[PDB]
Amino acid sequence: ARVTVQDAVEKIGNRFDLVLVAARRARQMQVGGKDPLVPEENDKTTVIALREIEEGLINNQILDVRERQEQQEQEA
Template sequence: MARVTVQDAVEKIGNRFDLILTAARRARQLQLHQRDPLVPEDNDKPTVIALREIEKD
């Protein structure tokens, strides 16, 4: 089970509402295989991967 804290991601995006929209768009891209993940998948769901990618940047 992945544990993702969104505090770092919120600081990078600006506010939690924009974070949710950004993560949802990215998760949709990953789910539809439109783009490759930028971080290791580790059996995580697309939403978790999207949040980890945002934290990483």
């Protein structure tokens, strides 16, 4: 469920980087390359990404770190 984004905006700020990071993460879930980090509540990937942002589990820094480590482990 989702009504307002004030905790996610708080946790990321600028009200515009929140959209971009949430879009990155929602596309990550939408394509079969990632799984939700919070218990799915029948939500769409956009709302799931927002709920992960609110929890603090997703940031622009977390996402790029995970992308980098996935690249590094791709070498294997």
